[PDB]
Amino acid sequence: DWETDPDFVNDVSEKEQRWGAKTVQGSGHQEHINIHKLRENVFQEHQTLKEKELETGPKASHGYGGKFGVEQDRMDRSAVGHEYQSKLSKHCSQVD
Amino acid sequence: WXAXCPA
Amino acid sequence: WXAXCPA
Amino acid sequence: DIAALVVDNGSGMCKAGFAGDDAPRAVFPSIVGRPRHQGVMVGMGQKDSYVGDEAQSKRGILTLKYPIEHGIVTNWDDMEKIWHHTFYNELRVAPEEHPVLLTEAPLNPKANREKMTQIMFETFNTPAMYVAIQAVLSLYASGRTTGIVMDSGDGVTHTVPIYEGYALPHAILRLDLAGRDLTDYLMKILTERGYSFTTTAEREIVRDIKEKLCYVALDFEQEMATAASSSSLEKSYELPDGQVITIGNERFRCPEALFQPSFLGMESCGIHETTFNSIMKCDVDIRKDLYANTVLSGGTTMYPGIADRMQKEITALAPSTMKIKIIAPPERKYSVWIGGSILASLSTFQQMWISKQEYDESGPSIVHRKCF
Amino acid sequence: GRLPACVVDCGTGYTKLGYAGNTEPQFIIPSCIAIKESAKVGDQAQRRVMKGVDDLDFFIGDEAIEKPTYATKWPIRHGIVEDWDLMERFMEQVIFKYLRAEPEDHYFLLTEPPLNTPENREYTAEIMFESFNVPGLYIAVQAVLALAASWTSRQVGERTLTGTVIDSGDGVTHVIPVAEGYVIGSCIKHIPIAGRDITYFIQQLLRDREVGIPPEQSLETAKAVKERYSYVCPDLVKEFNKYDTDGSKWIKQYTGINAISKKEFSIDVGYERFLGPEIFFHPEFANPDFTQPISEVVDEVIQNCPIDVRRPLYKNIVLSGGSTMFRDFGRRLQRDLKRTVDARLKLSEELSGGRLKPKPIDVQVITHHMQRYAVWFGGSMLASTPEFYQVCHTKKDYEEIGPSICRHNPVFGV
Amino acid sequence: MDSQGRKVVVCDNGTGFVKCGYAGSNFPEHIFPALVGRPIIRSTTKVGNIEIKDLMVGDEASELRSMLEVNYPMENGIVRNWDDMKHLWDYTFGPEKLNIDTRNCKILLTEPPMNPTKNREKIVEVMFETYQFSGVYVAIQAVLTLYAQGLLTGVVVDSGDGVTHICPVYEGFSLPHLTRRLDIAGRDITRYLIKLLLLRGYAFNHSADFETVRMIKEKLCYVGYNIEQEQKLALETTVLVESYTLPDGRIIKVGGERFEAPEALFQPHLINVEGVGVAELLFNTIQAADIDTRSEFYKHIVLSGGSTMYPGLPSRLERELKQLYLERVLKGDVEKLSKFKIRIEDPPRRKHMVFLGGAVLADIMKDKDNFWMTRQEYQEKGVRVLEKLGVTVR
Ligand SMILES: Nc1ncnc2c1ncn2[C@@H]1O[C@H](COP(=O)(O)OP(=O)(O)O)[C@@H](O)[C@H]1O
């Protein structure tokens, strides 16, 4: 598949190796950073990713109207909207 | 439930 | 099986 | 200015909102997820139990447990968590400043209402509360005063006939057969194809397959021959890991358990006979109005073909000269909440609350006298 | 006030020492100990009794390889401590000489491989609690800390808490799937084939072919040949042919110094450029018990996790440990995994009937800026949080229950 | 043999073992592992005198496993490999086994419950097109177990090598809504034992070493009784360490593992299976039945399958059921527990109950023509002949 390189050498001292090697173009002694800020930022970003992964996934709360919306296409040919209203029953036994 | 059915 | 579990 | 909270808390889905709106503010599955692994990345948001939507987005590594089975709260520590998440995280409002209108199924044990009231008055410290029958709010929302409500939630299916506002409690019928049983029956019939779903986190995938693909056949003994002759009825579904399933015959055999509960090993009659018997329990005079005002409600009645089959059944069952009209609006997935918001906003209702003073005088045993 | 907790990641070929709260280990020494050993007769538990104060005449780390009159012993083999006398002496100089920590004022966070026997944890607890008297201990699995070391090199908004960590160190290679922050322990895989097996294979190759390598350095050379001229090949027989037909380009030269007379020896590095790392995708080259490539092991690991967490696990395969710093290692791993996944998806589509074409599973192998010490930094995170002091085993817990307090880890139930 | 000279064979075709014989027999004529092996070379084994064919099947493929790569044609009761299964069946009806002319014989096959229908359809197709049997029937396993025991009511807990299933039957009427099927059995217990042994430094990674670990689990392992007491024994004393000699010659030591590998039937969460153990699943199956049948289901708990032969499994099952009943029926009344009457019927030859039930049923129905699926019905209808059994397929 992918071609290889014959003339690649990452000569490094054992002491240079313990920190990183020239096979990864960034490895080695990195700039010291704040760890708690990184931790909280990763937590918040994972929370935001979970929120959008939920929003873009299948939603059970989709047919209750409002922001969720109404599951239309579920009305039928013999279905009559609640907007409709019949009249009270009047049988001949009820007049005179 | 307690008797009949679970719940 | 075909879906779920192997068999 | 204080406005009541309408909080449904039925089995399967909890829907909360403010009194006087046209739609629930927050809808989320009423589950509680316990983590079933021991994670050591401490400080990254670890918890002991995830409630509502937060459980679904993590259901892969959780055991999901429903605190309400068949309309009965089998775990009250979990129900307190559900209510706390509803109050402080979904609605974001203190409970001690608004009255709370909860709903319940008919023919539930009295301990359910007793503990509902005790919790709403001793833990959340609400100033007033109420407990309403769901099938009555499902008629409030429909803009009626006479009709038979056929409410089929996730875990329980009950029918209540009302005429001119006077309910007939001697004809209220209940049937412990709903979405949760249809979802556990689909989990069984899916094995005939080779698909094996067993984990509580795959019951949700099966519930999604059921609420996206399944339909109710108008004629079961004919649709069986149809699905047997040709492959023009199959549908494919894509699991959240890549695998694809296909279901042709299960589509209408899943909701057919509603009309033939013998499929699940139950003696009881189907939902059409449950409604018909509940109609014929009333008086001879009001049966005509109950026939032509048959309301539907609840998620389990959101099946394409449910109204046609229900009419075909209750028409072959009713006298030949009675007109049947299955009132089934597309907003019936939340009719009970709309009825609750209508009832809580009325002025003549502001005397029907159970005040904190009343509860302090007679304890939790009061909810039986006030609440119908 | 509180002092920062000490982090001591003790690996088979290298130990990383530091104080929690920093960005990189303060020390990275070899995990070796130089003690005076002579020609004696009798058991090992009997010739180790040193009279007087002669049991403190030992060195560790870099200062133990220089000593030419001492005998150098490695206490840890395959990540599992096989010698506890040497390990106790190593720990006591780690604490009192390098870290300069008073072991009664600092919580300790040690590490372990997945399949460390419970008796090893009990002995470690006995050592740290009764001999050094630490106020608290926490023995975390090694690869699970390596996940929280890839966040410093990836763009904002894509630092996930879910991924499959592949830790290949000096003595052991283990695969740990983490999902949403919860270690899926019942799916962890553990293979004792790692860097040192590659170094033994390479020296056996060099010794069968080359001449002029001093015996006392035949290992030290096979490390400089392995960590310098080694790469990964897309195909084995094709690479043998490429070396046979055009040897003038693919065959390199290595020039080392004989550290007795300071002369220089020269050897030819040939096939062991690509045969070294190939024991990762052909473990039978070094241990005839295992026969399963690393791509297939990773695929089994991910295919055993829950269903709805399989697709994110494929997206964040994080490499860690030194033995994964081979050129185009992640590339070949991802290629094999993509082959397997696409074949499985096409089979599922064909079995479905041919109506839906599902989303192709994104497979990614993440190389980052911290791989060589990715474990330790992870610890330096966990041991810098407040909640850390709530998951440690306090000294009271040991004084009450005993060493059996440290007997459980997330690889086995109950 | 019937009144037509057509032999009536009974073949169990288990995931981990084939048990075949004739109708009316009291013992399986042949019990051999169901695995197919192919010859391979290994750098650690050297054999140069035993003739190894290009395809070994069954018993010889297990005794000669050191020089073969073996694979099972079945898994979880579902045939994963059809060619290997056809080879296993060729060997079963071959000369060095049951020696029958399949053109003039009837056969009685089995199948676990809640199994994909294409599996049974393809098995019947193979039996009618390849071997051209004159009659085939596919009975239910729990029905056969109750035939062998001699009952009409009981809750069969059949735990084979490949799969565990709990099937209650009352007065001869099958309740198919209570059939539970847990996917933990001998093979998952063997894999868990392999994991535990790997924690000790032993590596069983080959296809042949699986049978070695199986033979270890069968000799040493046992199900605990009071798991707290067993853990106290394993952690405080040293009376559970037992040595086993592998075929090559190595001597391994098995200690607490003896009661941790077979515990994954009662505590599935050890092997990453989210559910309930076999005892809790049995109790839920019973308590899902009508009130009038529970009291009789408790008195006829019929064990079956090889995986229920662990030393002390009946007693541990009974203790678990009594504890569940005390906590969840009597709500904690110890006085009433002495009135609770269980009876876990564990016959001595409970490892071949399904075959004995098949033998009884075939001895009963050999001479009928409305019981067997005849080859003519297959040539006329196809896979629709299965509708004779009560399983409706088109
Ligand atoms: N569109 C739909 N089609 C089929 N079944 C549905 C649909 N919507 C909901 N259901 C079933 O009904 C249940 C949801 O009903 P719901 O009204 O949420 O119950 P509750 O009001 O008691 O929470 C689910 O368990 C689901 O199985």
Ligand SMILES: Nc1ncnc2c1ncn2[C@@H]1O[C@H](COP(=O)(O)OP(=O)(O)O)[C@@H](O)[C@H]1O
């Ligand atoms: N750049 C590299 N390329 C190849 N192998 C390496 C490299 N760096 C280190 N190694 C090997 O990895 C091992 C040391 O890595 P390390 O992660 O410290 O293992 P451990 O932590 O178990 O000691 C040594 O065997 C060494 O030969």
Ligand SMILES: Nc1ncnc2c1ncn2[C@@H]1O[C@H](COP(=O)(O)OP(=O)(O)O)[C@@H](O)[C@H]1O
């Ligand atoms: N005495 C025993 N103790 C524990 N396990 C056993 C014993 N005998 C057999 N087993 C396990 O059960 C399997 C045999 O059971 P069996 O009922 O023959 O399986 P099948 O379902 O293939 O018929 C073997 O593969 C073995 O792993």
Ligand SMILES: [Mg+2]
């Ligand atoms: Mg409802």
Ligand SMILES: [Mg+2]
């Ligand atoms: Mg390491």
Ligand SMILES: [Mg+2]
């Ligand atoms: Mg069997």
